[PDB]
Amino acid sequence: DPTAKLVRLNPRGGDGPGIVFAPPAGGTVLGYIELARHLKGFGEIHGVEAPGLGETPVYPSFEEMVQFCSDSAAGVAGDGVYIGGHSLGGHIAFYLATMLLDRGIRPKGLIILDTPPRLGDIPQLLLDRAKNDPRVSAFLSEDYLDRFLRLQMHQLMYSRDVVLPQRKLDIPIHVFRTKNHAPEVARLFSAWENYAAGEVTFVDIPGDHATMLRAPHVSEVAQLLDRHCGL
């Protein structure tokens, strides 16, 4: 009955590969809008929005969320299209990519935004944002925000053991990592290699885990995605 929603995040008509972003805890794509606006080397940028944010609210298990997002991404994914994500969205993206491969669809690569495989070791606002940003206003409502917050609290209770990757992914992985983590977190990024059957590339980006997705750092993050993954 319920389905995730594939949402276009950037203006139509670009050249270059695509990206489908999986949502972090709370199920929204809002977090990727500024990034998408600054990318220049990509064609179509989409995000998957969780079911129930439009509708009956939905609180999926991690595996159910992966299923929802795979089914939505499968409409556009394949040759020339990356899967990507930040925070819990990186784990969903990894498992979504795995599921697409299992179904005979091969994304170009996996883009991980500043999260290690061990997720659990990371230590009014948007209403106002909507006044400044019709792209954000296109989603946000008082109702959408309440649903997002409830879904966020649910997804923040996902077990670290469940979201940990297990299998090796047979497409290239690009890990974009900030450089101000505590050493006990910094040391965990290399474990993406555990989950890579092929190439894995690490790229340092400016900012910190939160500020990398907003100005001024997001423009440099975008330039580095363009350089390393885009046209």
How many Cβ atoms are within 10 Å of 57's Cβ, its own excluded?
Answer: 15
Closest Cα partner for 142 from 152, 128, 155? 128
Contact 200, 173 (CB under 8 A): yes
Strands (E), 128-207: 173-177, 200-204
What are the extents of the domains in the chain? 5-229
Both tokens assigned to 14: 């670009």
Closest Cα partner for 23 from 177, 143, 139? 139
Method used to solve the structure: X-ray
Domain 5-229 has CATH 3.40.50.1820: yes
* 107: Cβ contacts below 8 Å, ≥ 6 apart: 20, 77, 78, 81, 82, 83, 97, 100, 101, 171
Q: Resolution in A, one decimal? A: 1.8
Give residue 29's identity as a one-letter amino acid code.
V
